PDB file of C-alpha atoms in Angstrom:
ATOM      1  CA  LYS A   1       2.934   4.016   6.734  1.00  0.00           C
ATOM      2  CA  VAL A   2       4.321   7.002   4.842  1.00  0.00           C
ATOM      3  CA  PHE A   3       7.979   6.267   3.992  1.00  0.00           C
ATOM      4  CA  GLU A   4      10.702   8.856   3.941  1.00  0.00           C
ATOM      5  CA  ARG A   5      12.505   8.891   0.587  1.00  0.00           C
ATOM      6  CA  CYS A   6      15.847   7.184   1.374  1.00  0.00           C
ATOM      7  CA  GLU A   7      14.145   4.824   3.828  1.00  0.00           C
ATOM      8  CA  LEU A   8      12.011   3.550   0.976  1.00  0.00           C
ATOM      9  CA  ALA A   9      14.942   3.406  -1.468  1.00  0.00           C
ATOM     10  CA  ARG A  10      16.817   1.009   0.856  1.00  0.00           C
ATOM     11  CA  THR A  11      13.658  -0.985   1.629  1.00  0.00           C
ATOM     12  CA  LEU A  12      13.079  -1.493  -2.111  1.00  0.00           C
ATOM     13  CA  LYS A  13      16.733  -2.379  -2.661  1.00  0.00           C
ATOM     14  CA  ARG A  14      16.638  -5.031   0.060  1.00  0.00           C
ATOM     15  CA  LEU A  15      13.506  -6.489  -1.536  1.00  0.00           C
ATOM     16  CA  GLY A  16      15.346  -7.029  -4.834  1.00  0.00           C
ATOM     17  CA  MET A  17      13.866  -4.202  -6.898  1.00  0.00           C
ATOM     18  CA  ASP A  18      17.090  -2.653  -8.141  1.00  0.00           C
ATOM     19  CA  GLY A  19      17.294  -3.561 -11.829  1.00  0.00           C
ATOM     20  CA  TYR A  20      14.385  -6.017 -11.620  1.00  0.00           C
ATOM     21  CA  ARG A  21      13.521  -6.810 -15.259  1.00  0.00           C
ATOM     22  CA  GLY A  22      15.807  -3.936 -16.190  1.00  0.00           C
ATOM     23  CA  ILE A  23      14.044  -1.356 -14.030  1.00  0.00           C
ATOM     24  CA  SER A  24      16.256   0.885 -11.899  1.00  0.00           C
ATOM     25  CA  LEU A  25      15.529   1.709  -8.254  1.00  0.00           C
ATOM     26  CA  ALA A  26      15.139   5.394  -9.270  1.00  0.00           C
ATOM     27  CA  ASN A  27      12.318   4.403 -11.596  1.00  0.00           C
ATOM     28  CA  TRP A  28      10.471   2.478  -8.870  1.00  0.00           C
ATOM     29  CA  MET A  29      11.049   5.439  -6.539  1.00  0.00           C
ATOM     30  CA  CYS A  30       9.615   7.836  -9.132  1.00  0.00           C
ATOM     31  CA  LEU A  31       6.600   5.477  -9.481  1.00  0.00           C
ATOM     32  CA  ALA A  32       5.835   5.243  -5.733  1.00  0.00           C
ATOM     33  CA  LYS A  33       6.276   8.989  -5.268  1.00  0.00           C
ATOM     34  CA  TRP A  34       3.793   9.916  -7.965  1.00  0.00           C
ATOM     35  CA  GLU A  35       1.391   7.061  -7.248  1.00  0.00           C
ATOM     36  CA  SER A  36       0.949   7.540  -3.473  1.00  0.00           C
ATOM     37  CA  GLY A  37       3.548   9.942  -2.041  1.00  0.00           C
ATOM     38  CA  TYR A  38       5.156   6.836  -0.514  1.00  0.00           C
ATOM     39  CA  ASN A  39       1.936   6.059   1.420  1.00  0.00           C
ATOM     40  CA  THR A  40       1.168   2.357   1.903  1.00  0.00           C
ATOM     41  CA  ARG A  41      -2.479   3.019   2.882  1.00  0.00           C
ATOM     42  CA  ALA A  42      -3.277   5.265  -0.103  1.00  0.00           C
ATOM     43  CA  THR A  43      -6.417   4.233  -1.984  1.00  0.00           C
ATOM     44  CA  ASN A  44      -8.277   5.528  -4.984  1.00  0.00           C
ATOM     45  CA  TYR A  45     -11.707   4.376  -6.100  1.00  0.00           C
ATOM     46  CA  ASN A  46     -12.479   4.568  -9.825  1.00  0.00           C
ATOM     47  CA  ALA A  47     -16.236   5.170 -10.187  1.00  0.00           C
ATOM     48  CA  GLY A  48     -15.988   4.627 -13.930  1.00  0.00           C
ATOM     49  CA  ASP A  49     -15.152   0.921 -13.801  1.00  0.00           C
ATOM     50  CA  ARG A  50     -15.769   0.176 -10.120  1.00  0.00           C
ATOM     51  CA  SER A  51     -12.138  -0.782  -9.412  1.00  0.00           C
ATOM     52  CA  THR A  52      -9.880   0.488  -6.611  1.00  0.00           C
ATOM     53  CA  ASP A  53      -6.123   1.280  -6.598  1.00  0.00           C
ATOM     54  CA  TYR A  54      -4.270   0.055  -3.504  1.00  0.00           C
ATOM     55  CA  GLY A  55      -1.135   0.991  -1.614  1.00  0.00           C
ATOM     56  CA  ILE A  56       2.240   2.496  -2.289  1.00  0.00           C
ATOM     57  CA  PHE A  57       2.149   1.541  -6.019  1.00  0.00           C
ATOM     58  CA  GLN A  58      -1.612   2.066  -6.387  1.00  0.00           C
ATOM     59  CA  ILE A  59      -2.143  -1.433  -7.830  1.00  0.00           C
ATOM     60  CA  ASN A  60      -5.580  -1.931  -9.421  1.00  0.00           C
ATOM     61  CA  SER A  61      -8.183  -4.500  -8.368  1.00  0.00           C
ATOM     62  CA  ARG A  62      -9.497  -5.244 -11.845  1.00  0.00           C
ATOM     63  CA  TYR A  63      -6.470  -7.361 -12.665  1.00  0.00           C
ATOM     64  CA  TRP A  64      -3.986  -7.681  -9.808  1.00  0.00           C
ATOM     65  CA  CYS A  65      -5.581  -8.275  -6.455  1.00  0.00           C
ATOM     66  CA  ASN A  66      -8.907  -9.502  -5.166  1.00  0.00           C
ATOM     67  CA  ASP A  67     -11.166  -7.190  -3.177  1.00  0.00           C
ATOM     68  CA  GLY A  68     -14.340  -9.163  -3.855  1.00  0.00           C
ATOM     69  CA  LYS A  69     -16.241  -6.090  -5.112  1.00  0.00           C
ATOM     70  CA  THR A  70     -14.770  -5.444  -8.601  1.00  0.00           C
ATOM     71  CA  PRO A  71     -16.971  -6.751 -11.497  1.00  0.00           C
ATOM     72  CA  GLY A  72     -15.395  -9.398 -13.730  1.00  0.00           C
ATOM     73  CA  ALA A  73     -12.036  -8.754 -12.063  1.00  0.00           C
ATOM     74  CA  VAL A  74      -9.121 -11.142 -11.740  1.00  0.00           C
ATOM     75  CA  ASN A  75      -6.282 -11.557  -9.201  1.00  0.00           C
ATOM     76  CA  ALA A  76      -3.025 -12.057 -11.118  1.00  0.00           C
ATOM     77  CA  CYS A  77      -0.899 -11.462  -7.993  1.00  0.00           C
ATOM     78  CA  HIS A  78      -3.041 -13.946  -6.037  1.00  0.00           C
ATOM     79  CA  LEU A  79      -3.335 -11.572  -3.056  1.00  0.00           C
ATOM     80  CA  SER A  80      -6.192  -9.987  -1.135  1.00  0.00           C
ATOM     81  CA  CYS A  81      -6.021  -6.295  -1.937  1.00  0.00           C
ATOM     82  CA  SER A  82      -5.711  -5.904   1.861  1.00  0.00           C
ATOM     83  CA  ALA A  83      -2.148  -7.291   1.516  1.00  0.00           C
ATOM     84  CA  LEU A  84      -1.386  -4.088  -0.430  1.00  0.00           C
ATOM     85  CA  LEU A  85      -2.298  -1.804   2.504  1.00  0.00           C
ATOM     86  CA  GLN A  86       0.276  -3.191   4.975  1.00  0.00           C
ATOM     87  CA  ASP A  87       3.158  -1.138   6.429  1.00  0.00           C
ATOM     88  CA  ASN A  88       5.398  -3.981   5.318  1.00  0.00           C
ATOM     89  CA  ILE A  89       5.752  -3.667   1.547  1.00  0.00           C
ATOM     90  CA  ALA A  90       7.008  -7.214   0.758  1.00  0.00           C
ATOM     91  CA  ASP A  91       3.656  -8.297  -0.795  1.00  0.00           C
ATOM     92  CA  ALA A  92       3.160  -5.040  -2.731  1.00  0.00           C
ATOM     93  CA  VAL A  93       6.696  -5.528  -4.117  1.00  0.00           C
ATOM     94  CA  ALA A  94       5.917  -9.136  -5.138  1.00  0.00           C
ATOM     95  CA  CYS A  95       2.848  -7.830  -6.946  1.00  0.00           C
ATOM     96  CA  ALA A  96       4.758  -4.917  -8.502  1.00  0.00           C
ATOM     97  CA  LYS A  97       7.284  -7.494  -9.811  1.00  0.00           C
ATOM     98  CA  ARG A  98       4.373  -9.614 -11.150  1.00  0.00           C
ATOM     99  CA  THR A  99       3.007  -6.582 -12.976  1.00  0.00           C
ATOM    100  CA  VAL A 100       6.303  -5.909 -14.774  1.00  0.00           C
ATOM    101  CA  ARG A 101       6.820  -9.544 -15.813  1.00  0.00           C
ATOM    102  CA  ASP A 102       4.097  -8.719 -18.377  1.00  0.00           C
ATOM    103  CA  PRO A 103       4.930  -7.111 -21.787  1.00  0.00           C
ATOM    104  CA  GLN A 104       4.468  -3.458 -20.757  1.00  0.00           C
ATOM    105  CA  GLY A 105       6.988  -3.589 -17.941  1.00  0.00           C
ATOM    106  CA  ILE A 106       7.052  -0.413 -15.822  1.00  0.00           C
ATOM    107  CA  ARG A 107       4.839   1.223 -18.491  1.00  0.00           C
ATOM    108  CA  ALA A 108       1.913  -0.656 -16.866  1.00  0.00           C
ATOM    109  CA  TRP A 109       1.333   2.443 -14.706  1.00  0.00           C
ATOM    110  CA  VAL A 110       0.254   5.525 -16.657  1.00  0.00           C
ATOM    111  CA  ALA A 111       1.699   7.801 -13.936  1.00  0.00           C
ATOM    112  CA  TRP A 112       5.163   6.363 -14.729  1.00  0.00           C
ATOM    113  CA  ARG A 113       4.717   7.351 -18.395  1.00  0.00           C
ATOM    114  CA  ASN A 114       3.331  10.743 -17.293  1.00  0.00           C
ATOM    115  CA  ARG A 115       6.065  11.783 -14.877  1.00  0.00           C
ATOM    116  CA  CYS A 116       8.941   9.291 -14.936  1.00  0.00           C
ATOM    117  CA  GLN A 117       9.535   8.164 -18.510  1.00  0.00           C
ATOM    118  CA  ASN A 118      12.295  10.117 -20.265  1.00  0.00           C
ATOM    119  CA  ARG A 119      12.776  12.173 -17.115  1.00  0.00           C
ATOM    120  CA  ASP A 120      15.862  12.734 -14.903  1.00  0.00           C
ATOM    121  CA  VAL A 121      15.012  10.491 -11.938  1.00  0.00           C
ATOM    122  CA  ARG A 122      18.501  10.472 -10.334  1.00  0.00           C
ATOM    123  CA  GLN A 123      17.108  12.868  -7.761  1.00  0.00           C
ATOM    124  CA  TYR A 124      15.047  10.085  -6.181  1.00  0.00           C
ATOM    125  CA  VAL A 125      17.960   7.948  -4.936  1.00  0.00           C
ATOM    126  CA  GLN A 126      20.744  10.498  -4.476  1.00  0.00           C
ATOM    127  CA  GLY A 127      22.212  10.327  -1.001  1.00  0.00           C
ATOM    128  CA  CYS A 128      20.339   7.157  -0.003  1.00  0.00           C
ATOM    129  CA  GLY A 129      23.335   4.828  -0.162  1.00  0.00           C
ATOM    130  CA  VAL A 130      21.867   2.491  -2.773  1.00  0.00           C
TER     131      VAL A 130
END
């Protein structure tokens, strides 16, 4: 599924993402936008370390989900990476929350640092009623 902006903003808000561990909804919106264009079936294989990024937040298989084909990988979210390719984003959100419970917080994703950090992200939630 490819979410429309405000549709996603409300979906994330209902899933308890607004202000989760101090992270605003606008920040999560900026993350999803740059990671996958709000596409839940987006995938990216990394030939360098043989890991794959899955879903709307492009969560990596080396540490967060199990895909059975990533060398010496772990599954901190305790989910099949397939769970991160569903139209329903509840599991991806649980995993995104798991990721930010760690020391880096939202900084876990380099794309967030690249195009969200110290940026004006108000634009992502304006007019969505959140």
